[PDB]
Amino acid sequence: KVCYFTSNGITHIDYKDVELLKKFVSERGKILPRRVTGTSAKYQRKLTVAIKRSRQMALLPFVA
Amino acid sequence: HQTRRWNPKMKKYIFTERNGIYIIDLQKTVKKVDEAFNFMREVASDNGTILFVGTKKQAQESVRDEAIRSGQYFVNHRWLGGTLTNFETIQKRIQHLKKIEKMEADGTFEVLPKKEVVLLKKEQEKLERFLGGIKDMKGLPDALFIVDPRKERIAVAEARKLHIPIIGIVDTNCDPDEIDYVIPANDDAIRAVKLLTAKMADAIIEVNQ
RNA sequence: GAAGACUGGAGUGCAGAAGAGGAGAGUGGAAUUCCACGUGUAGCGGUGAAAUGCGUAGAUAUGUGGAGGAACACCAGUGGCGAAGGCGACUCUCUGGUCUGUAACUGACGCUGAGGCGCGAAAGCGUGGGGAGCAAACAGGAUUAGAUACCCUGGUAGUCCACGCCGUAAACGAUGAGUGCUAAGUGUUAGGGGGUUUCCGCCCCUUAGUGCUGCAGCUAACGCAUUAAGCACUCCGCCUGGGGAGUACGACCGCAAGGUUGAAACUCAAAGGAAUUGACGGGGGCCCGCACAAGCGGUGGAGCAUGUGGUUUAAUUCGAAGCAAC
RNA sequence: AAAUUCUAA
Numbered sequence: 305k306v307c308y309f310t311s312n313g314i315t316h317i318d319y320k321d322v323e324l325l326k327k328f329v330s331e332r333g334k335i336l337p338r339r340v341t342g343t344s345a346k347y348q349r350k351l352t353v354a355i356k357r358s359r360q361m362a363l364l365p366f367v368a
Numbered sequence: 369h370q371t372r373r374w375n376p377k378m379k380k381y382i383f384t385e386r387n388g389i390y391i392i393d394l395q396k397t398v399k400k401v402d403e404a405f406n407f408m409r410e411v412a413s414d415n416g417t418i419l420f421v422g423t424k425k426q427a428q429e430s431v432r433d434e435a436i437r438s439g440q441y442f443v444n445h446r447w448l449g450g451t452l453t454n455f456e457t458i459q460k461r462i463q464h465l466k467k468i469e470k471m472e473a474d475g476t477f478e479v480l481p482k483k484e485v486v487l488l489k490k491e492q493e494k495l496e497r498f499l500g501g502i503k504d505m506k507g508l509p510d511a512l513f514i515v516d517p518r519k520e521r522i523a524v525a526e527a528r529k530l531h532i533p534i535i536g537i538v539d540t541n542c543d544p545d546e547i548d549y550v551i552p553a554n555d556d557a558i559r560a561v562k563l564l565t566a567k568m569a570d571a572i573i574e575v576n577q
Numbered sequence: 578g579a580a581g582a583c584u585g586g587a588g589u590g591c592a593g594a595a596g597a598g599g600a601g602a603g604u605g606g607a608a609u610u611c612c613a614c615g616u617g618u619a620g621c622g623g624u625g626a627a628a629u630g631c632g633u634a635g636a637u638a639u640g641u642g643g644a645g646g647a648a649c650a651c652c653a654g655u656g657g658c659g660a661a662g663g664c665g666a667c668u669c670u671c672u673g674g675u676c677u678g679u680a681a682c683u684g685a686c687g688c689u690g691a692g693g694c695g696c697g698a699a700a701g702c703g704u705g706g707g708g709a710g711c712a713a714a715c716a717g718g719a720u721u722a723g724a725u726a727c728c729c730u731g732g733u734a735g736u737c738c739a740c741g742c743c744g745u746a747a748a749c750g751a752u753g754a755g756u757g758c759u760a761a762g763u764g765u766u767a768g769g770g771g772g773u774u775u776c777c778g779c780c781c782c783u784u785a786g787u788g789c790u791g792c793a794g795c796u797a798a799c800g801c802a803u804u805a806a807g808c809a810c811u812c813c814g815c816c817u818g819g820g821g822a823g824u825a826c827g828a829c830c831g832c833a834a835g836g837u838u839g840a841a842a843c844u845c846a847a848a849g850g851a852a853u854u855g856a857c858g859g860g861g862g863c864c865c866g867c868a869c870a871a872g873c874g875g876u877g878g879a880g881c882a883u884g885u886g887g888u889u890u891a892a893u894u895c896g897a898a899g900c901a902a903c
Numbered sequence: 904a905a906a907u908u909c910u911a912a
């Protein structure tokens with residue numbers, strides 16, 4: 305119902321904030337859709353870019 | 369009504385906007401109702417008639433009471449199509465009503481079988497509900513009165529095809545050109561419709577007495 | 578036509594923003610196939626039903642390592658970018674365009690555009706590399722009256738990459754490019770300005786895209802409707818009944834397959850667009866009749882009477898032949 | 904979603 309990056313007030317989502325990238329991934333290991341999390345547009349796109357980068361640094365699981 | 373479902377052909381009559389709905393200017397309304405009173409006075413004293421069409425429930429009770437007070441002709445329930453164009457069929461139906469009422473009241477009150485209740489009473493009740501004030505309409509109405517023009521498109525169409533004047537209260541959600549002579553008012557609160565219809569009936573009585 | 582002047586067209590500067598725009602090099606995970614190993618026993622695979630096929634030299638399943646190719650799950654959305662074809666993993670280098678805001682700068686530098694010059698999905702061609710999966714041609718197994726098919730088991734070119742050709746599509750919004758003017762309502766993308774407000778948030782206005790509904794107007798109708806198929810001005814391309822035919826002859830281009838340009842003789846009186854009400858469907862819904870469901874007893878099993886096709890005689894009288902003839 | 908063929912004239 306509210307965007308986290310508009311409520312809390314985050315500027316950009318760096319990929320080292322593993323704890324920040326847990327409220328947006330599924331426990332099964334995938335990015336949650338925009339609908340369940342209610343994120344904006346710009347921040348959805350930069351958030352998924354950050355998740356992909358952190359994943360490819362073996363810092364979030366690809367599966368499981 | 370609200371600021372979403374409204375007719376831009378009535379931007380003249382809107383005035384500022386409160387939080388939620390439009391606000392109708394009242395000076396134009398008082399000029400319009402003065403003109404409407406003048407026209408009703410001009411038309412009432414002609415040994416003719418003025419028709420009342422109570423579309424909505426507020427209009428229902430208001431026009432019923434006002435017509436009974438002024439002895440005019442009115443329609444209260446659903447407006448069945450063709451009263452002002454199929455007037456031959458309508459008058460045949462009302463003649464049927466008069467004849468059945470006369471025979472039931474006078475002749476025998478018992479034809480032969482126990483078949484009056486099954487159909488001959490229910491149909492008479494339903495027809496008396498639908499027709500109502502048409503049982504006294506001798507000829508052709510001279511000026512219809514409508515509470516909500518957009519909820520009564522059939523009546524205004526039938527009057528405009530026979531080219532007879534129309535007076536009625538147009539809310540912000542109606543097109544003020546189908547009705548030839550208009551007063552901007554809210555046709556949703558029981559209070560205002562009562563006042564306007566009572567004013568029209570009073571003008572008719574004052575001119576025609 | 579000539580000489581000046583102006584900024585409301587066009588362009589530059591200044592400050593911001595978004596983006597699967599393009600090219601080159603390099604890395605990542607999941608999965609399919611192949612190979613090796615440890616128990617592991619008779620089946621696995623597949624169809625509407627089977628068989629071909631793989632399997633006691635020991636398959637499928639099963640865990641552990643190695644090789645190689647191709648495409649990038651979720652994010653993902655009438656969302657974004659591009660002139661069009663089209664562009665989706667991640668990172669870097671080289672790069673093109675667009676949008677908003679200010680008013681600093683030049684001062685009509687603009688629009689369209691035959692002939693030309695380029696780009697142009699997929700299939701296809703020439704040279705050289707690769708080739709996991711899929712798969713024209715092809716082989717076998719099924720189906721059918723037949724099946725050069727649909728279905729199943731395999732499988733070559735190709736699909737992939739570098740350089741060079743080809744130049745077509747339902748390349749479609751079946752809608753050429755500019756610029757103005759003409760009711761509304763409601764989503765969404767990228768911006769800017771304003772009020773409530775310590776912040777958060779809500780509401781209002783404006784620009785450029787992208788969808789839905791709907792007036793005036795337009796249309797043969799379907800329908801379009803500020804993203805016009807409305808009202809106008811400028812430039813370009815194209816049409817003049819259907820076949821014959823995008824064929825023949827001529828020319829240009831291409832290694833070829835073919836592409837572009839493109840007629841007539843003869844023949845017909847029709848060929849077409851929209852929606853109207855009926856009839857049909859091996860399209861859907863809903864409803865009913867001993868339809869099925871549940872019970873009761875029957876027929877097909879034996880004997881026996883009648884009727885029926887073959888039958889043979891000289892005829893075994895003619896006629897009714899799925900319910901709806903026996 | 905599954906799902907075999909089948910009016911000649």
Ligand SMILES: [Mg+2]
Pocket residue numbers: 369539540541554555556
């Ligand atoms: Mg109202």
Ligand SMILES: [Mg+2]
Pocket residue numbers: none
């Ligand atoms: Mg400018």
Ligand SMILES: [Mg+2]
Pocket residue numbers: none
């Ligand atoms: Mg592997």
Ligand SMILES: [Mg+2]
Pocket residue numbers: none
């Ligand atoms: Mg295989």
Ligand SMILES: [Mg+2]
Pocket residue numbers: none
């Ligand atoms: Mg194995």
Ligand SMILES: [Mg+2]
Pocket residue numbers: none
């Ligand atoms: Mg393995």
Ligand SMILES: [Mg+2]
Pocket residue numbers: none
């Ligand atoms: Mg574009």
Ligand SMILES: [Mg+2]
Pocket residue numbers: 663
């Ligand atoms: Mg595409």
Ligand SMILES: [Mg+2]
Pocket residue numbers: 675676
């Ligand atoms: Mg843009």
Ligand SMILES: [Mg+2]
Pocket residue numbers: none
């Ligand atoms: Mg040209």
Ligand SMILES: [Mg+2]
Pocket residue numbers: none
């Ligand atoms: Mg190709």
Ligand SMILES: [Mg+2]
Pocket residue numbers: none
């Ligand atoms: Mg090749």
Ligand SMILES: [Mg+2]
Pocket residue numbers: 748
């Ligand atoms: Mg296309």
Ligand SMILES: [Mg+2]
Pocket residue numbers: none
């Ligand atoms: Mg376009």
Ligand SMILES: [Mg+2]
Pocket residue numbers: none
């Ligand atoms: Mg075309």
Ligand SMILES: [Mg+2]
Pocket residue numbers: none
């Ligand atoms: Mg045109």
